[PDB]
Paper text:
The cyclic oligonucleotide-based antiphage signalling system ([name]) and the pyrimidine cyclase system for antiphage resistance (Pycsar) are antiphage defence systems in diverse bacteria that use cyclic nucleotide signals to induce cell death and prevent viral propagation. Here we show that phages encode anti-[name] (Acb) and anti-Pycsar (Apyc) proteins that counteract defence by specifically degrading cyclic nucleotide signals that activate host immunity. Using a biochemical screen of 57 phages in Escherichia coli and Bacillus subtilis, we discover Acb1 from phage T4 and [name] from phage SBSphiJ as founding members of distinct families of immune evasion proteins. We confirmed the critical role for [name] metal-coordinating residues and identified E74 and Y112 from the opposing protomer as further catalytic residues required for cCMP hydrolysis and release of the reaction product 5′-CMP. Together, these findings demonstrate that Acb1 and [name] constitute separate families of immune evasion proteins and explain the distinct reaction mechanisms that degrade [name] or Pycsar cyclic nucleotide signals.
To compare mechanisms of anti-[name] and anti-Pycsar evasion, we determined the crystal structure of [name] from the phage Bsp38 (2.7 Å) as well as structures of Paenibacillus [name] proteins (1.5 Å and 1.8 Å). Structures of [name] reveal a metal-dependent cyclic NMP phosphodiesterase that uses relaxed specificity to target Pycsar cyclic pyrimidine mononucleotide signals. Similar to SBSphiJ [name], closely related phage and bacterial [name]-like proteins cleaved cyclic mononucleotides with broad specificity. The observation of [name] homologues encoded in bacteria may be explained by the presence of cryptic prophages present in bacterial genomes, but also raises the intriguing possibility that host [name] enzymes may play a role in regulating Pycsar defence or other cNMP-based signalling systems. Structural comparison of [name] and B. subtilis YhfI also reveals that [name] enzymes contain an extended loop that reaches into the nucleotide-binding pocket, potentially enabling stable binding of smaller cyclic pyrimidine substrates.
Numbering used by the authors:
A (entry chain B): 3 to 248
B (entry chain A): 1 to 248
The structure:
Amino acid sequence: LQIQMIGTGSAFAKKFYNNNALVKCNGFQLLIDCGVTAPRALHELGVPITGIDGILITHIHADHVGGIEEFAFRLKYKYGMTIKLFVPAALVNPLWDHSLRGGLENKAEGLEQLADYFDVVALEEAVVHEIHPGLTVELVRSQHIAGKASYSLLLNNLLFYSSDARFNYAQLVELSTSGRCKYILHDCQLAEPAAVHATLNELLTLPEAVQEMIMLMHYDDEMEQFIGKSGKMSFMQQHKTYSFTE
Amino acid sequence: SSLQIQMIGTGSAFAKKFYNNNALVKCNGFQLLIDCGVTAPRALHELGVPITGIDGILITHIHADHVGGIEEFAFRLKYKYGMTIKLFVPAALVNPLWDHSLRGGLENKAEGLEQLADYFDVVALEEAVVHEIHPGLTVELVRSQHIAGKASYSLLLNNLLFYSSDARFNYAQLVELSTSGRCKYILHDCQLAEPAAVHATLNELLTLPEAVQEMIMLMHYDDEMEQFIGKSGKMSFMQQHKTYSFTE
Ligand SMILES: [Zn+2]
Ligand SMILES: [Zn+2]
Ligand SMILES: [Zn+2]
Ligand SMILES: [Zn+2]
């Protein structure tokens, strides 16, 4: 599979768009998260939203859901196209009821539910989902905001995508040796102290063999200050297409 | 009575060359941001305006180009600045703005953050009443037609400037504004493409008498705006980030 980050930034970064990933596999294009910046980032990249076969949501924050409304309106009224919206089962209801409904509800046109704007595909956690031949997604519950459901993803039993995620030393080391992944893309908070995101200092406590697997994402505007100061880890370059083999 | 307005963005909801149509109003030392869309934090950053300099935000309706930036404001004001600013909301929108839009991302029950008032001083505004939100600065809401069945508002500022926000064309209301004395200036939603649905179009606005056109600057416009410079009758287009001054 290939991944191109349409943004690599933390939630309020001004030099980097929202941390949202364009995944390409066997002709399918999956957008992981769809923040307030996602339409602008795709437009800058020259990717029409009609080229997105599905959007998968990992948790409810503006840098992950705040672009869905623009997608929904343009796909309905300009293109007349239905794409898939993959939502963790626990987030299906709040994503509409408490986030998207305000702007997207249009009772007088019969648009009362999220399914009126997308083919909504609820994904149970801890089950492998083949969303396209050769492309599998497995949700892993992450810790981000206590009491709010958020997920990491294992892609093609090959790439672990943390999304927003507190540091879990034992889980990451177990990923390195269980064979379940060869690559890790991990949330990286550059400022101290550690609250709801893994910090660079925390990630630097990992063994070198795990660091060799890791590229860093969801980072703030001072990222350039830490180039060459991230151990054996590397920062993902915004808009670069990476290829992940095996 | 006098006030200034600087549009931090002048674009329609998906314009890629203009930020969301959100207005920075300056009056007697108070800074009011009218609407706070997905682009508002980036536009303020580009202008060098810290969000700590915003005394209040007023919301005219619930769409992402008007409310999608509030979450960032709320988080930064709470966790970085420890500051409370005012959030002015039409009374009919107070509940849905939280319940159906902002709650998903901002609710944090384990920290005791269960309502919009935990992130702002929420000030509910009844329509058709004049509100003095700061000495010398008054706002009067006027129900607009935008999405049928959804509450949306235009605003009269300082009994001087009519700010349409998102608004279908209303010939009689605009001509009445031009002659009643209730305003001297109109800032109006302008859709450049045909046909008209939920926004006034340029062709509709060009049916207004010349005397009313002379009162109007155009906003909330799409990326083709530059093709229409010099082709808007006696109206003209608001320039993004220009500070306009309104008097008398
Ligand atoms: Zn995030
Ligand atoms: Zn988050
Ligand atoms: Zn709008
Ligand atoms: Zn609108």
